[PDB]
Design a protein around this ligand. Structure first.
Ligand SMILES: [Ca+2]
Ligand SMILES: [Ca+2]
Ligand SMILES: [Ca+2]
Ligand SMILES: [Ca+2]
Lengths: 93, 97
């Protein structure tokens, strides 16, 4: 009935699907971020699944510099992706 | 299938579903925000669909003070809802205290 509320639930559940695998269950480490990105957001990195790309992404996302991505930082990341899609919604910039 | 990519697509399209109804097609005015909230996010305001609630929400979301909610401000809003949902992922507050 409410696709946007369902979308939010997917955002929440997908985080935990990977954040709970290793160490802090509420934060994504490098390995968990790698798996989330490759499996759940393959269109984002595309062919850039190398270690250099993942280190750059980690540094971009880890705003509080604790070496992991928490839920707030993850939401900022997803917001950035949405904003990029927003820029091309009309079929031109 | 990639549910998270589908979720992002819905997040983007739902904005434009309402933002393009009046005036600036890339921003939600009060009227458009009301429609979006009531129809797409009824759980957020719940029973608080009065004018006082909607002015409060607009003030809370309109960070740049241009009287409307742009895409960036909308993302901040959805992020806050996601964080609130995150607190009850287990069906109780497992991150509290
Ligand atoms: Ca973890
Ligand atoms: Ca961090
Ligand atoms: Ca508008
Ligand atoms: Ca604004």
């Amino acid at each position: 009935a409410c696709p946007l509320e369902k979308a939010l639930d997917v955002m929440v559940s997908t985080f935990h699907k990977y954040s709970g695998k290793e160490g802090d269950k509420f934060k994504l480490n490098k390995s968990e971020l790698k798996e989330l990105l490759t499996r759940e957001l393959p269109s984002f990195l595309g062919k850039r699944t190398d270690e250099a790309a993942f280190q750059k992404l980690m540094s971009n996302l880890d705003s509080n510099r604790d070496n992991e991505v928490d839920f707030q930082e993850y939401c900022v990341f997803l917001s950035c992706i949405a904003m990029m899609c927003n820029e091309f919604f009309e079929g031109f910039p």
